């Protein structure tokens, strides 16, 4: 194959891994390509307990008998907004409240900055549909300083859990084109005071002492007692 785990080793079927190759294992199913996925069950299911005591109205019901009081309408709008924010922040919900639709800003997932993982997406273009919480986003992916050459589709762009910090210097207008952020090795010179690598190849993080204590208490090495 192109990329096997530990080469060819088949003493057990678990030695191969939970997936044999990053490529799709059949040609007819391109959706089986290995990629970073997102826990959409916890994220897409928003808390419905903020809509209690709140009379929502359908879109088609524009008859006069179904209308509500304007204070009740305003608290319904506030409850619907707090329902949409209740799990996390979307890309299309963070970029609509930004200058130039947030073009040039850095969006990132929550787990993209913790541990030895360092990755963000410099936004280039967003095409909103009519339901403004959805659509398609594009950006240059920056992983540990290295950057893509072309804008890639931001996968799971509609699932909430995204964050950004607005910087006026990175804002690119609709007249100009969003420039790609530079690769720290290739384009700009490497400086240890500006950017220092958290991780590199052939590097693994040192063992935390609480995880060591927890595993030695689970295996029975340390005397865990009530």
């Amino acid at each position: 194959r192109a990329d096997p785990l530990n080469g060819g080793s088949s003493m057990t079927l678990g030695s191969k891994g939970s997936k044999l190759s990053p490529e799709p294992h059949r040609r007819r199913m391109p959706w089986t390509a290995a990629k970073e996925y997102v826990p959409g069950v916890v994220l897409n299911a928003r808390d419905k307990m903020v809509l209690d005591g709140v009379q929502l109205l359908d879109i088609e019901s524009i008859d006069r008998a179904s209308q509500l009081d304007p204070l009740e309408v305003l608290r319904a709008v506030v409850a619907t907004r707090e329902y949409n924010i209740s799990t996390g922040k979307n890309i299309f919900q963070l970029a609509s409240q930004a200058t130039y639709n947030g073009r040039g800003q850095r969006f990132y997932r929550k787990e993209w900055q913790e541990g030895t993982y360092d990755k963000y997406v410099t936004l280039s273009a967003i095409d909103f549909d009519r339901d403004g919480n959805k659509g398609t986003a594009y950006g240059y992916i920056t992983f540990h300083g290295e950057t893509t050459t072309r804008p890639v589709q931001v996968d799971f762009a509609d699932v909430p859990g995204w964050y950004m910090d607005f910087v006026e210097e990175r804002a690119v207008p609709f007249t100009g084109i969003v420039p790609p952020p530079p690769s720290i090795g290739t384009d700009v010179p490497v400086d240890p005071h500006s950017y220092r690598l958290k991780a590199y190849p052939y590097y693994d993080a040192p063992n935390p002492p609480e995880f060591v204590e927890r595993l030695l208490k689970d295996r029975g090495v340390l005397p865990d007692t009530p």
Binding site: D63, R64, A65, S66, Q67, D69
Partner: peptide, 10 residues
């Protein structure tokens, strides 16, 4: 004609 009547709060 029933659904296009004005409600009581109105």
């Amino acid at each position: 004609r029933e659904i296009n009547k004005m409600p009581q709060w109105a």
